[PDB]
Amino acid sequence: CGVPAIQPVL
């Protein structure tokens, strides 16, 4: 859980 395959860019 909690680790997206597509990394969010903030």
Next chain:
Amino acid sequence: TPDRLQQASLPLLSNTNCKKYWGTKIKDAMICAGASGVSSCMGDSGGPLVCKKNGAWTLVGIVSWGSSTCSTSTPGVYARVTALVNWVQQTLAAN
């Protein structure tokens, strides 16, 4: 509302400091965040407030309520997941 998904970074506040804005409306199963130039608003309710803990995003709050005008200077109020996770674990186990 917008067509595409929006995101925003924002700081968590202590309930004590948050009561300075909301007074006694701030209950124990609530957590405040924001008052930083951004604000959750109508349509965002039920959505997540996530914090990265040990490398994974974890659900810290659920968009609950706040300023009737979504003032970016007032903190938003979220359901404090840590105070409700026992209910979640109980419901999932029984259903």
Next chain:
Amino acid sequence: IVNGEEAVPGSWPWQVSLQDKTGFHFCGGSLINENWVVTAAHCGVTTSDVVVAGEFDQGSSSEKIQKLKIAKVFKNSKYNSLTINNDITLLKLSTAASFSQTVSAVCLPSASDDFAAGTTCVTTGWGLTRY
């Protein structure tokens, strides 16, 4: 979200949209596994509403989204609508979500997890960007 920015599509894979049968987005939610969604009790979700997973642009016709029906609505009996306290509702999907690159679960904390004042977190949603 007022003052937010557009997210990278598919980068918040647990974010779902609650839409009524009309197709109107009214609330957000988070997938905690393929059969359960956590959302707010104030959203007033019913079994006629749909959970939309894998969506980014609600105005696109070409996204492979998953429209999931709701079997049961579990409103925390501790929810106090007058005070908006314990504002949490679990939704059991009648049709399980299919996890992919764009659809997955968010972690839940331990009731003993500490999240300090000053910590920068992130919030997402399709709420009003201007009020």
